[PDB]
């Protein structure tokens with residue numbers, strides 16, 4: 001690798017480690033914000049569009065219910081998410097602006113990206129052309145090069161987690177499964193269609209799972225559906241571990257070749273996990289037209305710009321029941337979340 005890349009990544013790691021070792025805490029409070037709209041909801045939390053009452057800036061506020069986090073066994077994961085997000089800095093990662101907790105909830109206040117999820121755009125249009133898929137894939141390749149160099153594994157790549165910004169570039173959101181790992185890790189987590197075989201088979205796994213997931217993502221972007229699909233998870237897992245994948249005839253030969261090397265069941269033979277690391281991907285013929293520096297610098301004109309009216313427009317997000325943000329009179333789960 002060129003010394004310029006080595007020095008970039010060394011500085012990136014220095015800056016990450018300083019924040020990793022001394023995390024920010026308690027940098028706003030709930031009554032600094034007005035609530036606008038629920039943007040998404042899950043088993044233990046929600047994401048809400050909020051507006052800061054003094055600056056007028058809009059943010060996406062992820063709210064996690066402490067009692068549900070404990071019950072759903074996500075304590076370490078929620079601490080990972082916040083500690084990682086407050087320490088990273090890369091063009092294609094959403095910025096954490098504030099964090100805090102109260103008696104009931106944990107809060108992560110991130111930049112609001114009004115263009116919505118890639119998943120919505122993909123499902124609207126059907127499939128992305130190879131140039132369009134490649135533009136997005138290049139951003140993920142660079143983002144994983146950054147994260148992996150910091151000893152971070154992402155573990156939840158999928159179009160739902162890739163927001164499209166005002167310039168048409170990606171912002172990765174949702175660090176709920178991200179973790180700093182030297183060596184191997186063991187937790188069963190992810191999304192069924194995107195799980196690598198070694199996760200399914202309960203092995204000690206490494207950053208190779210992210211490169212597998214990139215193969216799934218590229219396939220899904222270019223086909224419009226994922227490579228391993230079935231009605232129930234166990235049927236999906238059987239397909240994943242089988243070593244078989246079928247490609248649409250419209251895929252280029254170069255795309256198929258790259259995908260066979262990312263969707264390689266044997267992790268010791270998978271692109272991104274060989275001696276040349278990320279460079280086996282960056283140098284693959286499917287990426288021959290990619291100017292990696294221009295992508296990093298956001299100098300490539302994007303395939304499309306989402307339609308939205310301004311920084312508070314919610315049109316690219318869907319509608320959910322609006323529920324209270326209740327804060328108990330009594331502190332819950334204080335010990336578990338001391339470091340947050």
Ligand SMILES: NC(=[NH2+])NCCC[C@@H](N)C(=O)O
Pocket residue numbers: 119158159160193220226
């Ligand atoms: N494939 C993908 N990006 N995410 C999983 C989607 C599962 C289900 N909503 C569906 O098939 O619509």
